[PDB]
Amino acid sequence: HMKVLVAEDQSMLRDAMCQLLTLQPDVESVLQAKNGQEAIQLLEKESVDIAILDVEMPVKTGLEVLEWIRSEKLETKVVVVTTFKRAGYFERAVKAGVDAYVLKERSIADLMQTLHTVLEGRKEYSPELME
């Protein structure tokens, strides 16, 4: 039933993530975006329950996408996934009411749990970044 959008600029990771998401029993479909611009374009057109957003992407970052979602009052759940432990990225995401913030140090099983958590109206913040 889950309609998922994955915005990630590294083709190999995006592809791998999306393939594994598609094999999940509760996942209906997975939209792909290579940057923040394609991400917003898809959110302007398609039904999306949850967006998994990389931070550092060309054209528009995942944080910009999150802010757009908030400014437009979309109810999309947003999970930021990033390699970066930069405090400013986290602070900016929290100010923008992100639902979850996950480092790419986490596993795919970890990510899956996170998705379930936010679908249930809960939040999850990288322990490393709460710090």
Closest distance between ligand BEF and the C-beta of residue 25, in Å? Answer: 27
Residue 99 among known ligand-binding residues: no
What is d(CA 85, CA 48) in angstroms, rounded to the nearest whole number? 27
User: Does residue 70 touch its own copies according to CB under 8 A?
Assistant: no
Q: Residue 75 CB, nearest distance to Mg ion (Å)? A: 26
Does the annotation place 56 within a ligand binding site? yes
Tokens describing residue 54: 């990389």
DSSP 27-88: EEEEEEESSHHHHHHHHTTS--SEEEEESS-SSS-HHHHHHHHHHTT---EEEEEES---HH
Q: How far is the CB of 120 from ligand BEF (least distance, A)?
A: 25
Q: Take residue 119 and report the two structure tokens written for it.
A: 């679908």
Which is nearer to its own copies, 23 or 130 (by Cβ)? 130
Q: For residue 84, state whether it binds ligand BEF (rule: CB under 6 A).
A: yes
Residues that bind its own copies (CB under 8 A): 94-95, 97, 117, 122-125, 127, 130-131
